[PDB]
Automatic annotation (TrEMBL):
Gene label: Pel10A
Taxon lineage: Bacteria, Pseudomonadati, Pseudomonadota, Gammaproteobacteria, Cellvibrionales
Protein name as it appears in the record: Pectate lyase
Organism: Cellvibrio japonicus
């Protein structure tokens, strides 16, 4: 560290953000711009590389599937490169959107204005909350691409407050497993901090997939005593043999019957771990919970990834910075 600040070199969240700066060709900037909703957010799943300009819209914005957070970083970079203030304006509306979406607790919902159901929860899914906070933190700290006149000091204060609140949320939400600090569910109650379900097959759990990005975000923050403890505990969880499955890997090509296959000297992480036992588990469209992936419907076993190499990146990064 330096002071209490870790390097951003190798930080997964920082890598995501810097990549987003050039997510699309600059030739697509007007197309991207044209789908921004009135509220400053974007809808998800628009094929910007193929579609012509949109007509804006008045729908909820979302941070699912990289929406809003990717577009805003991209357009900030376009503003930085070309100086066209229409893009500055859009980035300002997008940052405002993210902060406006934030609950009093710091939680960020998946969709805003709130649509009801699981979308209202604090959404770590698809790196939404963690990477949204990363964007706001980069903005707050005048990091590229936000080292332009896009934001003022007063704006940065507001973003710092949102980042602080988000951090507070994350720290309060971090799951204490029989007294031991671990990681996060893919979604938590915005007000109650509790693990929540999402889709039918997304149950209350520790998330092997989403907890990486949460840790990566925390590692961008001033490493207070509490934050260092939180990060070290999360990294320790990823690096624990009670968490990874040693000698196996997840091979989605083999999912027809069983994608969890032996691989000497490999470690696999589950997508879902039981909150209390730390056992990897599976679900299905009926919302059931079970421990043998061969019991799952063919469609869910092949159509959704139930494990992966999630821990490698954060463990290696933690090692690099002395947190392992």
């Amino acid at each position: 560290m330096t002071g209490r600040m870790l390097t951003l070199d190798g930080n997964p969240a920082a890598n995501w953000l810097n990549n987003a700066r050039t997510k699309w060709s600059a030739s697509r900037a007007d197309v991207v711009l044209s789908y921004q909703q009135n509220n400053g957010g974007w809808p998800k799943n628009l094929d910007y590389n193929s579609v012509g300009n949109g007509g804006g819209g008045n729908e909820s914005g979302t941070i699912d599937n990289g929406a809003t957070i990717t577009e805003m970083v991209f357009l900030a970079e376009v503003y930085k490169s070309g100086g066209n203030t229409k893009y500055r304006d859009a980035v300002r509306k997008a940052a405002n959107f993210l902060v406006n979406s934030q609950y009093s607790t710091g939680a960020l919902p998946q969709f805003y204005p709130l649509k009801g159901g699981y979308s209202d929860h604090a959404t770590f899914n698809d790196n939404g909350m963690a990477y949204a906070l990363t964007v706001l933190d980069f903005a707050a700290n005048k990091r590229a691409p936000f080292d332009t006149d896009v934001f003022s000091d007063n704006d940065r204060t507001r973003f710092k407050t949102a980042v602080t609140k988000g951090t507070d949320y994350i720290l309060k939400a971090q799951w204490k497993q029989n007294g031991v600090l671990t990681v996060w569910c893919a979604q938590h109650g915005a007000l109650d901090y509790q693990p929540k379900k999402a889709r039918a097959y997304e149950l209350e759990s520790l998330s092997g997939s989403e907890s990486v990005g949460v840790l990566a975000f925390l590692m961008t923050q001033p490493q207070t005593a509490e934050i260092e403890q939180a990060v070290r505990a999360g990294v320790a969880w990823f690096n624990s043999p009670r968490t990874y499955l040693e000698g196996y890997t997840y091979d989605s090509s083999l999912a027809a019957t069983n994608p969890i296959v032996p691989r000497a000297g490999s470690k696999m992480w589950y997508r879902f771990y039981d909150l209390n036992t730390n056992r990897g588990f599976f679900s299905d469209r009926d919302g059931s919970k079970f421990y043998d992936i061969t019991q799952m419907s063919l469609e869910r076993r092949t159509g959704y990834s139930w494990g992966g190499n999630y821990g490698t990146s954060i463990i290696n990064f933690a090692q690099k910075v002395g947190y392992l």
